[PDB]
C-alpha cells in the first residue's frame, strides 16, 4: 500500500518536518542541513546558497550577508465554543436540499473533505510550490499584521520572507486570487458552493464584464498572525479550507445591533486599537483544523487567529438564501467607502443578472403553474428596490459602470414589480 510523493535533497527523501533544510538557489532543490553540512545556526549568515553539485559550475555559496497584546487580548477573553451554533455536517450530506432546509443561517464545519466535491492539492503541497504556479514575479497583497497595513510586493519577495528564520515582521498573504494562474487548475470550489453561487449559475458566458474574481483565494498565514474582524465584501458567503496547519475563527452573528456596531467601529480611524469582540454579546471561537472546511454565512463578522504556519484556500459566493443580508452588508460597505482591495468586483452586475433570472422564473411560474418560493419573491422585492436606487436619476452615474450590456433597467424594474404584485396574491 504505497503512493508517489515529492522528494528532496541528495538523499531523495520526502519532506521531514523535524529536519532543517536549505534551498539551493541554482537548482531550486531543498537540501537537509545534515546532508550538505550546513547547521541551522549557520543559515542566517548565508546570502546565496549553492549545493555542492551546483557549486562546481555555478560558483561557491555567497555565505556573506555582510501586535502581541492584540493576540494576547484575543486569547485572554473567554468565548463560547462554536459547537453551540456551528453545525458539523459530513460533506456527502451538505447538499442543496440541506441548505434549503436550514437556510444557511449559521456556519457549517465539514471535518473531512469527502463528499464536499472540493478539489485541493495534497498536504504535500508547500508555499514553495505556490510560488511556482502562481508566479514568482506576481505582485501580491501582503498584510503587515503588526502595523495592520497592506503593501504590494513580489510574490518571490514574500516567499523569501516566509522561508527565513527570525521573522522580524508578521506578514500575511490573505488576498491572493489565483484563478488567473496555473494553480487555478489545482483548486476547485465545493460542489455545494457552485450550486449556490449566483455567478456560477446566472452569469452569462457571453457577458462582456469579467466575472467576480473572488472564487479561488489562497491564504498563506504565518505563525502568530492576526486578521481583524471584518465582513466579506457584498455580504458574500465564504468557504475556508485549511490545507496545512490550523486557523481559529471568531464568528459574530450579523444581528441588527452587531452590524451597526461593526460599521461604527470599522469607520473609526482608530479601529486597529479597539478590540471589537468586546462590544458584542456573543462571539464564538471556532477552531478549523487541517483538512477541515468552514462555510461562513452572509454578513457574519469574523476574525481569524493563526497559531501555526497555515496554508488555506478560500472563496466568496452569493446565494438566494441571504438576499436581504447580502444587500445590507453591501450598504454598510458602500457607506464605509473603505479600500477596494478586498472588494467584491461587479457585485451589482451579479445582482442585475440575478434580477433577470427572477423575471424569467416569474414568467416560468406562470407557464409551469407553480408559485415561486416566498424567499425568492422577497429577494426579488429587495433586488428590485436596489435596482431603483441604483438607476435613480440622481444616482445613475455611480452604478452605470456595473450595468450589463443591452440592459433596460426601467423595463426590468417595471416587469419585476408587476410580477411580484401578481405573486403576492
Amino acid at each position: 500500500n504505497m503512493a508517489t510523493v515529492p522528494v528532496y535533497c541528495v538523499c531523495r527523501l520526502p519532506y521531514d518536518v523535524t529536519r532543517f533544510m536549505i534551498e539551493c538557489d541554482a537548482c531550486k532543490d531543498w537540501f537537509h542541513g545534515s546532508c550538505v553540512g550546513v547547521e541551522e545556526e549557520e543559515a542566517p549568515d548565508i546570502d546565496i546558497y549553492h549545493c555542492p553539485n551546483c557549486e562546481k559550475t555555478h560558483g561557491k555559496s555567497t555565505l556573506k550577508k555582510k501586535s502581541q497584546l492584540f493576540i494576547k487580548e484575543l486569547r485572554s477573553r473567554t468565548f463560547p465554543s462554536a459547537e453551540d451554533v456551528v453545525a458539523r455536517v459530513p460533506g456527502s450530506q451538505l447538499t442543496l436540499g440541506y441548505m434549503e432546509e436550514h437556510g444557511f443561517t449559521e456556519p457549517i464545519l465539514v471535518p473531512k473533505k469527502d463528499g464536499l466535491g472540493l478539489a485541493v492539492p495534497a498536504p504535500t503541497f508547500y508555499v514553495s510550490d505556490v510560488e511556482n504556479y502562481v508566479g514568482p514575479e506576481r505582485s501580491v497583497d501582503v498584510t503587515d499584521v503588526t502595523k495592520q497595513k497592506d503593501c504590494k510586493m513580489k510574490l518571490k519577495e514574500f516567499v523569501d520572507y516566509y522561508y527565513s528564520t527570525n521573522r522580524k515582521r508578521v506578514l500575511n498573504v490573505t488576498n491572493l486570487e489565483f484563478s488567473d494562474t496555473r494553480m487555478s487548475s489545482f483548486v476547485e470550489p465545493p460542489d455545494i458552493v457552485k450550486k449556490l453561487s449566483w455567478v456560477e449559475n446566472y452569469w452569462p458566458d457571453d457577458a462582456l464584464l469579467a466575472k467576480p474574481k473572488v472564487t479561488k483565494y489562497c491564504l498563506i498565514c504565518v505563525k502568530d498572525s492576526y486578521t481583524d474582524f471584518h465582513i466579506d465584501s457584498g455580504g458574500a458567503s465564504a468557504w475556508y479550507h485549511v490545507l496545512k496547519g490550523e486557523k481559529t475563527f471568531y464568528l459574530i452573528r450579523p444581528a441588527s445591533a452587531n452590524i451597526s456596531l461593526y460599521e461604527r467601529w470599522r469607520s473609526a480611524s482608530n479601529h486597529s486599537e479597539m478590540f471589537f469582540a468586546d462590544q458584542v454579546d456573543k462571539c464564538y471561537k471556532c477552531i478549523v483544523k487541517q483538512g477541515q472546511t468552514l462555510f461562513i454565512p452572509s454578513g457574519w463578522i469574523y476574525a481569524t487567529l493563526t497559531p501555526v504556519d497555515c496554508l488555506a484556500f478560500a472563496g466568496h459566493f452569493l446565494h438566494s438564501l441571504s438576499v436581504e443580508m447580502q444587500m445590507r452588508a453591501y450598504e454598510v460597505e458602500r457607506r464605509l467607502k473603505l479600500g477596494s482591495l478586498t472588494q467584491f468586483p461587479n457585485f451589482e452586475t451579479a445582482c442585475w443578472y440575478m434580477g433577470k433570472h427572477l423575471l424569467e422564473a416569474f414568467k416560468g411560474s406562470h407557464k409551469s403553474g407553480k408559485q415561486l418560493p416566498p424567499h425568492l419573491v422577497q429577494g426579488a422585492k429587495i433586488l428590485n428596490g436596489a435596482f431603483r436606487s441604483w438607476t435613480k436619476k440622481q444616482a445613475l452615474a455611480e452604478h452605470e459602470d456595473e450595468l450589463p450590456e443591452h440592459f433596460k433597467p426601467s423595463q426590468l424594474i417595471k416587469d419585476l414589480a408587476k410580477e411580484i404584485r401578481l405573486s403576492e396574491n
Binding site: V17, R19, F20, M21, E23, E40, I46, Y163
Partner: peptide, 7 residues
C-alpha cells in the same frame, strides 16, 4: 537563502 526550520 531560503530555509526550512525544524519542529
Amino acid at each position: 537563502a531560503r530555509t526550512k526550520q525544524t519542529a
